[PDB]
Amino acid sequence: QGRFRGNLSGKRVDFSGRTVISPDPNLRIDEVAVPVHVAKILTFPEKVNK
Amino acid sequence: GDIIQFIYGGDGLDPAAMEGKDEPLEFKRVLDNIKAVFPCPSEPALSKNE
Amino acid sequence: AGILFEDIFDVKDIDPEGKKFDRVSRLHCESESFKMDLILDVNIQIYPVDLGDKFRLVIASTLYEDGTLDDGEYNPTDDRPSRADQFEYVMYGKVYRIEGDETSTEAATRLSAYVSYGGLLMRLQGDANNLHGFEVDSRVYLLMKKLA
Amino acid sequence: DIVERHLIDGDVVLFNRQPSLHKLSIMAHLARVKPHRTFRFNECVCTPYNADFDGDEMNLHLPQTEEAKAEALVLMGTKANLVTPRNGEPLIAAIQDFLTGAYLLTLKDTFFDRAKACQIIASILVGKDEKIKVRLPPPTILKPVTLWTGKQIFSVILRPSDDNPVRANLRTKGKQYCGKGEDLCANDSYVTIQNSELMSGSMDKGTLGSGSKNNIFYILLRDWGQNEAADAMSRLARLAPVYLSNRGFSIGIGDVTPGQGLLKAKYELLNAGYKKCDEYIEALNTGKLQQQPGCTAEETLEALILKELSVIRDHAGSACLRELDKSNSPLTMALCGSKGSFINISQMIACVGQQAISGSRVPDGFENRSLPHFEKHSKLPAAKGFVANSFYSGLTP
Amino acid sequence: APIPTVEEKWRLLPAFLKVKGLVKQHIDSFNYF
Amino acid sequence: KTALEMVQAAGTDRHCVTFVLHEEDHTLGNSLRYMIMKNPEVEFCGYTTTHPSESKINLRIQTRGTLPAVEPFQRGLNELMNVCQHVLDKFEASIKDYKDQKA
Amino acid sequence: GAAAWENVDSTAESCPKCEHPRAYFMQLQTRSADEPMTTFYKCCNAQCGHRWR
Amino acid sequence: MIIPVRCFTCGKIVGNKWEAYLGLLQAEYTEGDALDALGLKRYCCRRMLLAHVDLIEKLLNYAPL
Amino acid sequence: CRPYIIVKKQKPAVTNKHMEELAQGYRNFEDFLHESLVEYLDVNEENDCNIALYEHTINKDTTHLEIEPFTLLGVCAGLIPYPHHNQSPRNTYQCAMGKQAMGTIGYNQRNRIDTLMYLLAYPQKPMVKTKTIELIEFEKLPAGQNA
Amino acid sequence: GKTPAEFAKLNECPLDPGGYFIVKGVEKVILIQEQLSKNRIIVEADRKGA
Amino acid sequence: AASQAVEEMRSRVVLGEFGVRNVHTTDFPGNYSGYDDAWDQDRFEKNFRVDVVHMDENSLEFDMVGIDAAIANAFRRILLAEVPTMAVEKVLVYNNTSIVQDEILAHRLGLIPIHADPRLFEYRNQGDEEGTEIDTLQFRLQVRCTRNPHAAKDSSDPNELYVNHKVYTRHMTWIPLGNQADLFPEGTIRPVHDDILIAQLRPGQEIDLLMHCVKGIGKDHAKFSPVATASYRLLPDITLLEPVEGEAAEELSRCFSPGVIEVQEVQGKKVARVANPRLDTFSREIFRNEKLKKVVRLARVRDHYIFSVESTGVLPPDVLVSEAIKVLMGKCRRFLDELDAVQ
Amino acid sequence: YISALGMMTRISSQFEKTRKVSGPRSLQPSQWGMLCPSDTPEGEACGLV
Amino acid sequence: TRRPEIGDKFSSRHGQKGVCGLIVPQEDMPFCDSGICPDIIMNPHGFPSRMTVGKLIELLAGKAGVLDGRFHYGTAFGGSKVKDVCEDLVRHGYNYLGKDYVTSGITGEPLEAYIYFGPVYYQKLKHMVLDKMHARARGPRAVLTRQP
Ligand SMILES: [Mg+2]
Ligand SMILES: [Zn+2]
Ligand SMILES: [Zn+2]
Incomplete structure (x- = not known):
């Protein structure tokens, strides 16, 4: 947990979630379902354009 | 800046794109696919020399 | 008249490797007029066959005897004079392989046509003179009728 | 202006598991929202993540930069990482309950x-x-009854619409190939597809699974791009469960029970093996026993006893496989290779093999014997680790 | 002629559990202490 | 807002029509599928569910000729109406006759 | 020696490489991540040297 | 800790008979004839009334009162 | 140490009459210990002795008879119905999960105030119950349902 | 030496196995320690093979 | 012949030793060449019929002939989920001293069926938790458990010790609103079974609450399901390929149900036959006897469905089937109106 | 209740995860009739508890 | 008061740990001839690899018990055998192997293969998705190193 291994090589970040998984065949292989509760928390900054 | 290999694996092929057993292509399957996808009934056959 | 082949076969074996399936059996048949061997897969539940039974078989390019080759699609509800009306068991398939006999290393004259009836195999082997008109990747019909 | 919008559909989002072995353990996908509370995705990606849906937690990271999102969509795209860089074998493919x-x-x-x-x-x-147009293929049998075979329905997955330029072609051998069929196998194990149309053969893990090359999805990826293979896999994963539910696939206690002839063969093989083991014991203890070259006499006896017990096991398994009738769910799963194998069926039904610890029989924990329930210096099969009965009949302590 | 077997042999187990068994170990140890 | 129609492609062809039905489940979908399946001029009929979370279904209909694929839908609806009226009348008559013969 | 080498159980099976009776199987159970067992087949009569999983 | 009103699988009202079941346990009737008299043809209600434990009495023994 | 029934001359020291007297209350386990019918054996002591699992397995060279085979399993493994028909990692995972299974704790769980407690709304006793379940009275405090 | 009624009067479950101490309101259990037997000669191979 | 096999596949469903065949419905135009499987309302109305074989309180058994599996499954699913009834959703509690949890108590009260007629009420609109006289009902429960003033000295049984210690569903009282007292006569609005055990009490405890019963469908929650078990099965038609005589005939009676195979003496020798294939359950035990496998043939009729419907006491099951048919008609009418509005 | 009843009869090892020897972590015949073979915690404590 | 939902871990008294993947209505659930609809659907594919025949034996014993109102014992190296529960099943009128005639709830047509129904002891674990779901906004950071 030092500076090199615990704070430089690998460090914790925000805008992340951890949840239990469950199978769903009705979704594409490149798609993934996200719960509404986590979706209301994780935000993406978009810039206003034309 | 020191060079480890003048060419990767002596040939420079991507291991992920390897379609055969350590070989880039399998000529038999490719030839069969070409024959099946493009069957020309209005053109004659070819001999060895041709 | 797109009749590519026509003969009368007799069954020499029903299941040489046992009853591998319930609704399908590996029929092995031999022609009486020519030297044409036939390995066939059919549905015995709707069309049962026996060892001592003979059947007239016809491989046709089209199902209409008038000569119209308009076979872009097939509607089962159609009612019109066709070849299937003169037969009992009709299967629509596609000839997909032509392979020469490998037993005769020289002066070989026997060829075999491999046709897929939706997974139901049909290998018709015999002299190449009888198989005239057969071309790979060609959609055709098979019509069989049992005889006395 | 910078607006912190909620996670909506179409956003590229990461998806990672805590134990990361290879690069495919963390991949970028398209985010979708559902009212439930779990991360749901297609099971075809379970093989790279090595997940099993038994309560394992999963991470999900959301980039905060357009460049990072684009790099995730391009490099870590699911459709662009269908094969591992180790040996080129595809990992995202059909899985259990899809192969069967x-x-x-x-x-x-x-x-x-x-x-x-x-x-x-x-x-x-x-x-x-x-x-897209349905493109209903013509029926095979039409005169007595109008029927469509399952292979045509499976080929529909490859080419759903008329305008679809996908023309898949493959010619390979299955797992149960007899060796002499060459598209004439009695077991129908020679896979042959022409122009995205299944001609003959039975699909299994050898062609649909992520085992090795010659996969149909691998051929689609290499010949027509990533999108066509992804669409084919989605159609398969959305078609196979419907038919599997509408048909019915169950396993019962009667699917693992032995037969009369199987029990007779097992009894005869056990008697013969016990007689041969007793003969070997008497030969080694009293007199001269043929010493296998490269080892001592006791190691030769151990190897001979192991060989005899494993011969009994293999013969009982062969007898069970011969006496088992078709439509058996364990046998069907072993044939298709989705889960299990012939060894597991033989161990459950016919006989359990020798319990091998570190590639050898059970060592003697006590003095000159494994357990006090056996005689000292006794190297009998059951006394050293052999399992005479099976899981169905019950195991001794 | 098989040897006769006591059918209620397992009845020896509950009688043993009445004075010893699951939790009596730590109890007897702490009492002796 | 409940039932809507989708064309097969940008060509807006009336031969292949996909009806998206909201607030529906397998019951009425399968009933209508069976009722319109017996129509001779229907090449393909099939219903499916988009996702078990949402209560909506998609039923695709492709006819033989130049049928708008909407007229067979209304025909099947009217036929199911007639079948339901007939079974209701028959069940009421049977219940009445049973209750009368019981006494 | 081939006589001492053939101290194995599997005889007259169907290998997935050449589909010939002769065989030399090895069964391993030392995998907890992979619940099923592990096979190693050695088909060798004409000195083919088949070795796979 | 208490007998549920409806069975999990079917949904037939089964709690109202629980006391009666106890009454059938106070008479000569065994389990089988009691479940037969209660009108439980399907085995789900039989399982619901048999595998249930009446822990409400033990809890009320610890109730404040 | 483990108790074992003394066997002499190919016959156990405990008979059906002794078990009937035990069931009626004439004797207890201590009386079996005193009358040289059941004795404790250590690992080192049983290393030199011969034990038989069942009566049909008893041979001429037998010193003690196993009381009960299912006593080999502990407390959690006793909850497994027919454990000899399953794989051993399956039994290990089952014990690990049963150590974390939710259910009733005791009769005073309502008055008990712990930092974290999990209770089942409609707990039901198992249909396929082991004798160990009845010995530990698990059926009075189930930790699951029957579905 | 208490009856289940006396256990109910003391707010304690009779089926409770017990065997644990209560300190500061928390329940602590002392695990059974396992150790090598003392006063016994042990013959073993050394790290160098002796 | 081939026609016999075609008829067996089209009209019968055979149950083999390992699996069931001919399970798919195939009587559609285009599948059979030698038959005109096009829809005909006249032939359908001619071949269809409904015959009730048993009908008592909370139980109905009737055979339908001529209907298909799709319409039968649709009726079953409408009866199971799409029949609206009256059940409790909102619970207002006032100082619950019971040991039973308040949430568990409300969940148990929600599962209690109500004898109120669901057709006389309407669905509650979104919001308006207060509820209106048209689409709500109020059931007030107030039970106070106290010690019996006069009882025996021992009083080992809790019945003699205390009073009202078991809160049965009979203790609740329906409180009319507006004009519900005049519209509904006394005794109509009441608990169904009147003997459901809600909870058990002790002296000092008290349960006081009000239940707001509203309308809802079974698809939203299982508590609105009016039927306990509403299902249908294909009518078995056991046929004998060869005459069965001798002691093996008795074996036949032991293989199938006791009430389907009957034995008689034509000329002093025993002979078995089919008496009533309705009572058979298809245990498939005849497959155990090796000799008798080739003499019988288990079959199910494709167009003969025996429906068994057990109501929970809210209303008789015939009215339940009528309301299911009416709900299907209403769905069809809604779809027709939507299609007309589109055009 | 099962959790507490099982924890009341737990035994720890002297090694306490000092080195992955895998020797004592294995199942020995000496545990016959004295210790439960199947019951063991899943993880790094397998074979030591 | 927590209700089972997607993500709740479940045990099966045989080490077959499971997670709720989908919640289907009662109408979509298959039914028996008497009208019984089972609650939980278990994957059969987990049986061959994990050789959990004891689960099938427990299911059969529990079915026999709920049929005859008995508690069959699953004692190690003993207990009730398969013959007794098979005789109980053949006496009560059910199949002696558990597999029964099952009709599909969705399509309304019978299934091709028989389905294995039975009462099994299911136990829910403490591992619930409600306590494991965790999302992270910007939030606080550590004092020493400005990291989450
Ligand atoms: Mg896992
Ligand atoms: Zn080989
Ligand atoms: Zn029930």
Whole structure:
């Protein structure tokens, strides 16, 4: 947990979630379902354009 | 800046794109696919020399 | 008249490797007029066959005897004079392989046509003179009728 | 202006598991929202993540930069990482409950009428496939009854619409290939597809699974791009469960019970093996025993006893496989290769093999014997680790 | 002629559990202490 | 807002029509599928569910000729109406006859 | 020696490489991540040297 | 800790008979004839009334009162 | 140490009459210990002795008889119905999960105030119950349902 | 030496196995320690093979 | 012949030793060449019929002939989920001293069926938790458990010790609103079974609450399901390929149900036959006897469905089937109106 | 209740995860009739508890 | 008061740990001839690899018990055998192997293969998705190193 291994090589970040998984065949292989509760928390900054 | 290999694996092929057993292509399957996808009934056959 | 082949076969074996399936059996048949061997897969539940039974078989390019080759699609509800009306068991398939006999290393004259009836195999082997008109990747019909 | 919008559909989002072995353990996908509370995705990506849906937690990271999002979509795209860089073998492919379903679908005994075939075909017309023509293939048998085989329904997955330029072609051998068929196998194990149309053979893990090359999805990826293979896999994963549910696939206690002839063969083999082991014991203890070159006499005896017990096991397994009738769910799963194998079936039904610890029989924990329930210096099969009975009949302590 | 077997042999187990068994170990140890 | 129609492609062809039905489940979908399946001029009929979370279904209909694929839908609806009226009348008559013969 | 080498159980099976009776199987159970067992087949009569999983 | 009103699988009202079941346990009737008299043809209601434990009495023994 | 029934001359020291007297209350386990019918054996002591699992397995060279085979399993493994028909990692995972299974704790769980407690709304006793379940009275405090 | 009624009067479950101490309101259990037997000669191979 | 096999596949469903065949419905135009499977309302109305074989309180058994599996499954699913009834959703509690949890108590009260007629009420609109006289009912429960003033000295049984210690569903009282008292006569609005055990009490405890019963469908929650078990099965038609005589005939009676196979003496020798294939359950035990496997043939009729419907006491099951048919008619009418509005 | 009843009869090892020897972590015949073979915690404590 | 939902871990008294993947209505659930609809659907594919025949034996014993109102014992190296529960099943009128005639709830047509129904002891674990779901906004950071 030092500076090199615990704070430089690998460090914790925000805008992340951890949840239990469950199978769903009705979704594409490149798609993934996200719960509404986590979706209301994780935000993406978009810039206003034309 | 020191060079480890003048060419990767002596040939420079991507291991992920390897379609055969350590070989880039399998000529038999490719030839069969070409024959099946493009069957020309209005053109004659070819001999060895041709 | 797109009749590519026509003969009368007799069954020499029903299941040489046992009853591998319930609704399908590996029929092995031999022609009486020519030297044409036939390995066939059919549905015995709707069309049962026996060892001592003979059947007239016809491989046709089209199902209409008038000569119209308009076979872009097939509607089962159609009612019109066709070849299937003169037969009992009709299967629509596609000839997909032509392979020469490998037993005769020289002066070989026997060829075999491999046709897929939706997974139901049909290998018709015999002299190449009888198989005239057969071309790979060609959609055709098979019509069989049992005889006395 | 910078607006912190909620996670909506279409956003590229990461998806990672805590134990990361290879690069495919963390991949970028397209985010979708659902009212439930779990991360749901297609099971075809379970092989890279090595997940099993037994309560394992999963991470999900959301980039905060357009450049990072684009790099995730391009490099870590699911459709662009269908193969591992280790040996080129595809990992995202069919899995359990999909291999068995497609195998039962592509069986030669399956025949569907117009209504059921139309329902099975329409079971995939969702999402981007809602704006394509069905292209119902012509029926095979039409005179007595109009029937569609399961192989045509499976080929529909490859080429759903008329305008689809996908022309898949493959020619390979299955797992149960006899060796002399060459598209004439009695077991129908020679896979042959021409122009995205299954001609013969039975689909299994050797062709649909992520085992090795010659996979149909691998050929689609290498010959027609990533999108076509992804669409084919989605159609398969949306078609196979519907048919598997509408048909029925169950295992019961009667599917693992032994037969009369199987019990007779097991008894005879056990008697013969016990007699041979007693002969070997008497030869080594009293007199001269043939010493195997490269080892001592006791190691030779141990090897001979192991060989005899394993011969008994293999013969009992062969007898059980011969006496087992078709439509058996464990046998079907072993044939299709979705889960289990012939060894597991033989161990559950016929006989359990020798319990091998570190590639050898059970060592003597006590003085000159494994357990006090056996005589000292006794090297009998059951006394050193052999299991005479099976899991169905019950195991001794 | 098989040797006769006591059918209620397992009845020896509950009688043993009445004075010893699951939790009596730590109890007897702490009492002796 | 409940039932809507989708064309097969940008060509807006009336031969292949996908009806998206909201607030529906397998019951009425399968009933209508069976009722319109017996129509001779229907090449393909098939219903499916988009996702078990949402209560909506998609039923695709492709006819033989130049049928708008909407007329067979209304025909099947009217036929199911007639079948339901007939079974209701028959069940009421049977219940009445049973209750009368019981006494 | 081939006589001492053939101290194995599997005889007259169907290998997935050449489909010939002769065989030399090895069964391993030392995998907890992979619940099923592990096979190693050695088909060798004409000195083919088949070795796979 | 208490007998549920409806069975999990079917949904037939089964709690109202629980006391009666106890009454059938106070008479000569065994389990089988009691479940037969209660009108439980399907085995789900039989399982619901048999595998249930009446822990409400033990809890009320610890109730404040 | 483990108790074992003394066997002499190919016959156990405990007979059906002794078990009937035990069931009626004439004797207890201590009386079996005193009358040289059941004795404790250590690992080192049983290393030199011969034990038989069942009566049909008893041979001429037998010193003690196993009381009960299912006593080999502990407390959690006793909850497994027919454990000899399953794989051993399956039994290990089952014990690990049963150590974390939710259910009733005791009769005073309502008055008990712990930092974290999990209770089942409609707990039901198992249909396929082991004798160990009845010995530990698990059926009075189930930790699951029957579905 | 208490009856289940006396256990109910003391707010304690009779089926409770017990065997644990209560300190500061928390329940602590002392695990059974396992150790090598003392006063016994042990013959073993050394790290160098002796 | 081939026609016999075609008829067996089209009209019968055979149950083999390992699996069931001919399960798919195939009587559609285009599948059979030698038959005109096009829809005909006249032939359908001619071949269809409904015959009730048993009908008592909370139980109905009737055979339908001529209907298909799709319409039968639709009726079953409408009866199971799409029949609206009256059940409790909102619970207002006032100082619950019971040991039973308040949430568990409300969940148990929600599962209690109500004898109120669901057709006389309407669905509650979104919001308006207060509820209106048209689409709500109020059931007030107030039970106080106290010690019996006069009882025996021992009083080992809790019945003699205390009073009202078991809160049965009979203690609740329906409180009319507006004009519900005049519209509904006394005794109509009441608990169904009147003997459901809600909870058990002790002296000092008290349960006081009000239940707001509203309308809802079974699809939203299982508590609105009016039927306990509403299902249908295909009518078995056991046929004998060869005449069965001798002691093996008795074996036949032991293989199938006791009430389907009957034995008689034509000329002093025993002979078995089919008496009533309705009572058979298809245990498939005849497959155990090796000799008798080739003499019988288990079959199910494709167009003969025996429906068994057990109501929970809210209303008789015939009215339940009528309301299911009416709900299907209403769905069809809604779809027709939507299609007309589109055009 | 099962959790507490099982924890009341737990035994720890002297090694306490000092080195992955895998020797004492294995199942020995000496545990016959004295210790439960199947019951063991899943993880790094397998074979030591 | 927590209700089972997607993500709740479940045990099966045989080490077959499971997670709720989908919640289907009662109408979509298959039914028996008497009208019984089973609650939980278990994957059969987990049986061959994990050789959990004891689960099938427990299911059969529990079915026999709920049929005859008995508690069959699953004692190690003993207990009730398969013959007794098979005789109980053949006496009560059910199949002697558990597999029964099952009709599909969705399509309304019978299934091709028989389905294995039975009462099994299911136990829910403490591992619930409600306590494991965790999302992270910007939030606080550590004092020493400005990291989450
Ligand atoms: Mg896992
Ligand atoms: Zn080989
Ligand atoms: Zn029930």
